[PDB]
Structure 1
Amino acid sequence: MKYMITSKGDEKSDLLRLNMIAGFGEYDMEYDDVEPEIVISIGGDGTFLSAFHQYEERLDEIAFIGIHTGHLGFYADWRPAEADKLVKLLAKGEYQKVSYPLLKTTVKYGIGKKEATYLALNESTVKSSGGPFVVDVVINDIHFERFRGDGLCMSTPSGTTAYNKSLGGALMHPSIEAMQLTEMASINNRVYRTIGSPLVFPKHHVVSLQPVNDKDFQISVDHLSILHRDVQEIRYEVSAKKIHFARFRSFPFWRRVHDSFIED
C-alpha cells in the first residue's frame, strides 16, 4: 500500500527516512505523498503535528506512525533502532488501528467572512491582540461566565500533556471523547469571576467565546497562530473526525505519561 515519510530535516531524520524507503523497496509498498494510506513521521511531536496537518483532509483514509529521533514524544512512539522492524511490520499489514478524538474550532466573522473551520490534535487557544482579554463564555447556548485574563486553552485528550498541562489541566486518557478548557491567568475579585477549574466537556457540547469589546484575537491551532480580526464567535466542539494510528505493540498512554514526566 501507498505510504510517505516526513522528516524533521536534520541529518539523523533524513538518513533514517532514506533507509526506511530502501527497506520498503523490498516489499509492495509504493511511495505516494499525495494519497498515502500510511504516513510515517520522523523527528519529534512537532514533526508529527505537521504531518497530521498536511493530510488533514484524508484522515479517514490514513494511519499515522511516529518515530522520535530525540525524546520520546506522545505521538512518536518508535525508537530509530526499531525502524527496520517497523518497515517489516507495516509491509506485512500487521497492525490494528487506534483512534484519538480531535477538536473542531469554528471562527465566525462579520461580513465579509466566510467562517473558518480548523482541526486540532493538541489544542486551540485564544488571547487578545494586546489588549486586555475579555470574552463571554457560552456553553450550549447558555451564558456561563465572563472571562478576563490572558486567554483560554481548549485541549483534546492527547493534547492534555502539552499546553493544557502547563496551565493546571487534567491529563485525560485519549479513549475519552472529550475536550478540556483551561484558564490562562484569570482575574478574580469581588466583581470579576471565573470558574477557576478546568472544565471537561463531552461530545456534542458546544463552547462559544464571544467578544465583549475588542473583536480581534490571536488564535492558535496547534503550531499555527494567526491574528483574526472582526471576530463574532469562536466555537469549540469535539470533532466527528478522528486521527488513526497504526500499532503494532502495546505502549499504554499512562506509560507514555510516566516515561515523559516521572522518568525513563
Structure 2
Amino acid sequence: MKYMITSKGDEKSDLLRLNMIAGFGEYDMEYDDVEPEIVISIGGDGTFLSAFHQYEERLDEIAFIGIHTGHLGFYADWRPAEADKLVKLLAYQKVSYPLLKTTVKYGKEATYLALNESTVKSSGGPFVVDVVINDIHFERFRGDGLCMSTPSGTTAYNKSLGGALMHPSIEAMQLTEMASINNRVYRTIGSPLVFPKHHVVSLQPVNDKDFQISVDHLSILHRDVQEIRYEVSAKKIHFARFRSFPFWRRVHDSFIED
C-alpha cells in the first residue's frame, strides 16, 4: 500500500519519520508522495493542516493519520511513543469528517476547501458585508469579520469567538462574528449560526470590494470581490482509525485536563 509522511521540520519530527519509514521497509509498503493511500502527519495540527491541503485533490483515496510531536492536537491522535505500534497495524476503520466549501466570485471564480474554517476580513479600513442566507437578506454585518467553521474546526478559531463546540458527526457549518458593531442603527444577530447541509450563506460587499480571505492557515488578499459563498462541501476527509478516541474525550484532554 502506497503511503507518505510529512514532518514538522524540527529534529524530533524528522527522526520519528525516518524510523517509521525504516519500519515500513520491513513490510509490503511503498513510499510514494504522488499518489499515496495513507498520509501520515508528524508534528502539530498545522502540520496536519498542511498535509491536508497538500492532498486535497485526492481526498477519497487517502486516510489521514496524525501524530503530535508536542502537545496533543485534535487531528494528531498518537503520541510518538506509540509509533512502532502504528506501522504494524497500518500493514482498520475509516471515519469521515465534514468539510467547508468556499466560492469566491469576482467581476472567473475560485473554490476552496477548508478543514478548520474560512474567514473574511477587511483589506484595511472598515468591514461591511450583507449576509445572505439562501437568497434571503439576513443582516448587514459591521465589525472586524466573520468566520465559517467546520465541525472539527469548532474547537479552533470558532471556539475563541464564542462559538459552540460541534461534534464532527454532524454535517454542518458554524458562523461567528468578530466584534460586531451593534447600536440603535446597526443590528446583528450576535449569536453564532449553525447551518445544515445544502444551506448556502453568501457574503456581499457594500462599499469596499477587497477582502483578506483566509482558508485554514492560508490568507490572501482578494480584490474586486463580488460574492463570497459558504456551503457544506460534498467532499469529506477520511481518517484512519485503529481504536477508540472520542471527540469529547479529545476535547476534554485539550481544554479541561490531561
Output the TM-score relative to the length of structure 2.
Answer: 0.99
Counterpart of 2:60 in 1: which secondary structure?
helix
Q: Distance in 2 between matches of 1:80 and 1:250?
A: 18
Q: Deviations over 1:96-143 (max 9, x none)?
A: 00000000000000xxxx100000000000000011000000000000
The answer as to 2:95 corresponding to 1:98 is yes
What SS class does the counterpart of residue 18 from structure 1 fall into? Answer: helix
Could you give the per-residue CA deviations for residues 213-248 of structure 1, whole angstroms, max 9, x where no partner exists? Answer: 000000000000000000000000000000000010
**Structure 2: where are the runs of 5+ without partners?**
none
Structure 2 CA distance for aligned equivalents of residues 127 and 9 of structure 1 = 30
* 1:198 pairs with 2:192: yes
SS, match of residue 33 in structure 1: coil
Q: Which residue of 1 aligns with 2:141?
A: 147
Instruction: Give the whole-Å Cα distance in 2 for the aligned partners of 1:37 and 1:147.
Output: 43
- Report the Cα distance in structure 1 between the residues aligned to 2:10 and 2:182, rounded to whole angstroms: 46
The superposition leaves residues 52-90 of structure 1 with CA deviations (integer Å, 9 ceiling, x where unpaired) of 000000001100000001110000000000000001010
- Structure-2 separation of matches of 1:203 and 1:25: 43
- For 2:35 and 2:223, locate their aligned partners in 1 and report how far apart those are by CA, in whole Å: 34
Q: Does 1:226 align with 2:223?
A: no
Distance 1:202 1:11 in 2: 43
Deviation at 1:155, TM superposition (A): 0.2
Q: Which digits, 9 at most, give the CA deviation of each residue in 1:23-61, with x for residues without a partner?
A: 001111100000000000000000000000000000011
Determine the C-alpha separation between the residues in 2 that align with 1:52 and 1:169. Answer: 24
Aligned equivalent of 1:43: 43
CA distance in 2, matches of 1:90, 1:13: 19
Q: Which residue of 2 aligns with 1:238?
A: 232
Identity of aligned residues (%): 100
**Partner in structure 2 of residue 138 of structure 1:** 132
The one of 105, 108, 132 equivalent to 1:108 is: 105
What is the DSSP-based 3-state SS (H/G/I as helix, E as strand, rest coil) of the residue aligned with 2:198?
coil
CA distance in 2, matches of 1:108, 1:138: 15
Q: SS state of the match for residue 260, structure 1?
A: helix
**Per-residue deviation, 1:190:** 0.7
Show structure 1 runs of 5+ residues with no match.
none
Runs of 4+ in 1 over 2 A off after TM superposition: none
Other structure's SS at 1:182 match: strand
2: CA distance, partners of 1:81 / 1:205: 43
Does residue 23 of the first structure (1) align with residue 23 of the second (2)?
A: yes
* Residues in 1 aligned to 2:29 and 2:193: alpha-carbon distance in whole angstroms: 44
Name the count of aligned residue pairs: 257
Match of 2:234, SS state, is strand
Q: Which residue of the partner structure matches residue 201 of structure 2?
A: 207
Q: Give the distance between the partners of 1:185 and 1:60, measured in 2 at CA.
A: 38
Matched position secondary structure for 1:165: helix
SS of residue matched to 1:191: coil
CA RMSD, aligned part only? 0.3
Question: What's the secondary structure of 1:61's corresponding residue?
Answer: coil
